[PDB]
Paper text:
When expressing S. cerevisiae mApe1 (sc‐mApe1) lacking the N‐terminal propeptide, we predominantly observed isolated dodecamers when imaged at identical protein concentration and buffer conditions, indicating that the propeptide stimulates the trans‐interactions between multiple prApe1 dodecamers. Based on the twofold and threefold end‐on views from class average analysis, we determined a low‐resolution negative stain structure at 24 Å resolution by imposing tetrahedral symmetry (and EV1E). Class averages of sc‐mApe1 dodecamers including views of twofold and threefold symmetry. Fourier shell correlation of the EM reconstruction of the sc‐mApe1 dodecamer indicates a resolution of 24 Å. In the crystal, ct‐mApe1 is present as dodecamers, which are formed by two asymmetric units each containing six ct‐mApe1 molecules. Comparison of twofold and threefold views (left and right) of the determined 24 Å resolution EM map of Saccharomyces cerevisiae mApe1 (sc‐mApe1) (upper row) with the simulated 24 Å resolution map of the ct‐mApe1 X‐ray crystal structure (lower row) shows very close visual agreement. A black sphere represents the N‐terminus where the propeptide would emanate from the dodecamer.
Ape1 is synthesized in the cytosol as a 55‐kDa zymogen that includes an N‐terminal propeptide (hereafter referred to as prApe1), which oligomerizes into a dodecamer 17, 18 and further assembles into larger aggregates in a propeptide‐dependent manner 19.
Numbering used by the authors:
A (entry chain A), B (entry chain A), C (entry chain A): 3 to 164, 177 to 184, 196 to 402, 410 to 470
Write the structure that this text describes.
């Protein structure tokens, strides 16, 4: 009510955090200012998690984040309430050696598509450069990370004609600059430019993982302002909604009076099939849960009983009804904007032969005043379901023109998404109890 | 000998138990009247399994069942004797919203194929409706399950012309009926009909997972009665044979005088690639074994040693020689009916480079008086083998016209299958001992 | 009213009488227990038909039957009320030499499709064997006929792969057995099997004309039981309805108080184009009428005047609206189930330019309380019309999936068909009188 924007907050979030690194870093800052404590995955957690439980988060690779709330009174039979989503998006990436010699004076860079064989939709769009630099300051032996972002400067673009065709229109090297490990691999100007943004010298740059992304800020749109146009909606839209839902929920939770175990886990490499250590199949969720339950109590914890009592919402976007292409959609099985969360059903696929998860989500929405929509036609749901043995439901916030460089969704859909996910954390355990043995 | 029918018992079993729900439920009743004890997967088993071991079974989702016999004197070095098979079959499923408005007075329903893009073989067949309903009785807060089956009434059929073409030819709503969660999603008549079968009100129906299946009862066939014609043979044929084998074997087992760990595990979603929590990759088998060995003894159990000493028969059907298509078959590598179990060999595939499993099965058959046949050309064998590290052999009972709505096999093949599997449980440990380190 | 089953009687009739031989034999038994007298076509009828007229039937080839009621007071100007239909159906036939040598131990038989190049619809269906055997008992010189039927035993099936491809999966010869004329032509087991069914020796078998047919019994179907699923509906459905109509009508007829000449004639070989001596072009109808009118009175009978005053209903099935394929059907010219008889209209074809027959059928239905449906898009109507000169109307009971091995129609359609045809015999003469010269 007037606070369904929130859509502006989302638009600012996509605009200010273009790469996966930025998104994870942004959530890290948001979590710890809500008193979630960072745990290194490289250290054992026995002495970091106690009888009281608490609020925590861990990070793998700077692109895979898990945030969790563990109750003082949690036990195996309570299970875990999980929302799983992905934070990688389709982009163009600077190649390891991005160096191209001039084409009639034009400066260019070797780049590769990430997550697809990219569209004509990427042509004639203003593209910023940004992501992660690795560097070693002089007279040190620590390799540190810096985040870099050219916004609002579009440093390049893939021109249409009015890795041969899709290429990009973008003084002498100092002795020190030649000492850099990246000297031959990237043109000196680009290196000088990223070095400037990070606040380090060119000679100190070890490596980089840079994207090219649309710098056009998102907008509320439509004559009645029913829509939201923005880049990278898949699946930063569900990720944002789930994380904000968890943090709003965490507000009213003293972990000492809780018997729940709740988590939002955000994965990398969904666009690539998820079979990486930062992806859904790398098992960060399962790692978090086993570690937490191990560190938390002296008693042994039966993980099979934990997962048998758990519910995983595998949150990934569905397709809005495109009124221009009615034939691809199935009648009575397509979502519309500004209504509510969409349940992905597929006759083949992991949720066929599981009517219970569908029923549970319907009951939740009923209790919380939400609406649910249907959509029948390396996704993380099947991976997580089979990896844990826990009942998993595929759903999400529907959008138009998915895997476009600029997608569309309802202007109320971020808020409705946060609302549904907030309701899930509050009620899933109670609602799942009445299915009993099922 | 006269008791190789058993084929009638099988025919009655397929006829009376059309969906996966019915099949699992049927086995649950058979097991517990043979004194197997049900364990909830949602409860820890420490205090349900003791020093004596025992006979048990557990169920996941109503479609994934594991039955096991744990010996009082079992130890890691004995391993597990496993038969793994699947109970899902190709069917048509009622869509989540099955509602179609009338086509010139004809009533119809939206349905989807499960496990394939379905055949012309499904045209002009009498189709019953059946499966699982979820319901909540009035003034309650328990969601219960009921099984429903229209047999012998064919409620519908997919007509040939003498999800556009393959669709199906099948008073006013009470206020109470409109109160049902499924009111808009399925036509009132269908809801009234399934409600009647379950013995509940329409208003009490929460959700349903219904199939459409062939109601034509199986028959012994051929002029010399050499064949068995029936629906859903893949892989309810191996599942039946393996379960009956285990139960016949269990008869002569006092668990107090046993040092063996035996199981038949039945999976869902093999036709869909097995990557679901109810499928082979959901790890019910491994869950059962870890839980049992944990609960059973105070000593710690090395699971790697258990699997290194185990044998898994991954039981799935092979192809009978179709004399009409000799060229697709490979000479000296095709099974015939009424001879015995068929070993699936594949030069690429998980049993290439493992001659030991083949040798073991041959030795077993030799000892038990069985015959073995060969067949070289998300299967569960590779999944289970890699998931456990245990030596796994793909084999099964061969059939004709697999993935037809009505398949064929030997009339003696159910009995021979039970015979072979019964021999396996009796002798595998002894036979595998002489391979020693291999 | 409660007696619109009648659908069960029809289902039992198709089930118990699989071949044309069985169907004709069945009608022969029904007719003569309703006091119709058999006339041999090989004997002159002068002294078998008298001044009183009577109820009669004759048979050609065991597959072509004519039943008629001749009134004592009949005259040329009264004409004949004719229903013409066919009793042959699409089947597979055993070839004259059905012998195939074993294919890896499998027994097989050479067969040919009758009436089409047969469907994938014939694959994986349980097939019985049955039809006519000719035999000569030992020390005799009479060649007799026996009917044979394996129902409910499916002796074979045409397998799908999971006259090359469509072929069929099915001790030493006695000296006497080698003496049979069919010894080399059919495998000894099949011959022994059919000999057993007939109650004769193998050595006594002269010849056989055997079909392979679906042994699946028909069912009432649909959630509201609106449908009838059964094999061989075309055109045993109209044949049954017409014959039962005649017999119900014959009940209230003393031939001594009648001035009508009524007949139902059932033809063979409609699926083959009708140009056989047992088909519509073999002229059994015309033969019956000329013979009867010759034998019946001493006065000469003008046959041209008889036919000029006659009405022939050429009863053959039309197509039900298949809601899955709306585009093949013509709006306002397609029948629905459980409504009534369907009039076949075709802008090209023999009923174009004859509006009078259509009008007469409409008037009949009006008088008898029937409903009439339309269907615009070697048929017997054109043959009979041109052969007699008599006004002929094409109509019938509509069905789905015609020329499938299992077709569908209304559950009320047999009864409505009998009702319409019964009304026709009662009123055609009276209704046709008001068209006068037309």
């Amino acid at each position: 009510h007037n606070y369904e924007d929130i859509a502006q907050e989302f638009i600012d979030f996509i605009y200010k955090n273009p790469t996966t690194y930025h998104v994870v870093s942004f959530f890290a800052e948001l979590l710890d200012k809500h008193n979630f404590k960072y745990l290194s995955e490289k250290s054992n957690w026995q002495d970091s998690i106690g009888e009281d439980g608490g609020k925590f988060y861990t990070i793998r690779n700077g692109t895979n984040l898990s945030a969790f709330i563990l109750g003082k009174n949690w036990r195996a039979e309570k299970g875990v309430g999980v929302i799983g989503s992905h934070v990688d998006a389709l982009t163009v990436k600077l190649k390891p050696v991005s160096f191209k010699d001039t084409a009639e004076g034009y400066g260019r860079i070797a780049v590769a598509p990430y997550g697809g064989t990219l569209n004509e939709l990427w042509l004639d769009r203003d593209l910023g450069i940004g992501g992660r630099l690795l560097y070693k300051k002089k007279g040190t032996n620590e390799i540190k990370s810096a985040l870099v972002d050219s916004t609002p400067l579009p440093v390049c673009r893939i021109p249409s004609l009015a890795k041969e065709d899709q290429t990009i229109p973008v003084e002498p090297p100092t002795d020190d600059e030649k000492k850099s490990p990246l000297f031959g691999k990237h043109c000196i100007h680009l290196l000088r430019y990223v070095a400037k943004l990070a606040g380090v010298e060119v000679s100190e740059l070890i490596q980089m993982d840079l994207d090219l992304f649309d710098v056009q800020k998102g907008t509320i749109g439509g004559i009645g302002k029913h829509f939201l146009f923005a880049p990278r909606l898949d699946d930063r839209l569900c990720s944002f909604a789930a994380m904000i839902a968890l943090i709003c929920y965490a507000k009213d939770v003293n972990t000492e009076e809780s018997d729940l175990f709740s988590t939002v886990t955000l994965y990398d490499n969904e666009e690539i099939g998820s079979l990486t250590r930062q992806g859904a199949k790398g098992g960060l969720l399962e790692s978090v849960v086993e570690r937490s339950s191990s560190a938390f109590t002296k008693k042994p914890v039966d993980l099979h009983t934990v997962w048998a009592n758990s519910i995983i919402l595998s949150a990934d976007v569905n397709h809005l009804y495109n009124p221009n292409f009615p034939e691809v959609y199935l009648k009575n099985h397509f979502p519309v904007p500004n209504v509510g969360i969409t349940l992905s059903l597929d006759p083949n696929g992991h949720m066929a032969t599981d009517v219970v998860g569908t029923a549970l989500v319907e009951e939740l929405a009923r209790r919380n005043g939400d609406k649910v929509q249907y959509f029948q036609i390396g996704t993380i749901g099947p991976s997580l379901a089979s990896q844990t043995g826990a009942r998993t439901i595929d759903l999400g916030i529907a959008q138009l023109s998915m895997h476009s460089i600029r997608a569309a969704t309802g202007s109320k859909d971020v808020g409705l998404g946060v609302k549904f996910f907030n309701g899930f954390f509050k009620h899933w355990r109670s609602v799942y109890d009445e299915f009993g043995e099922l």
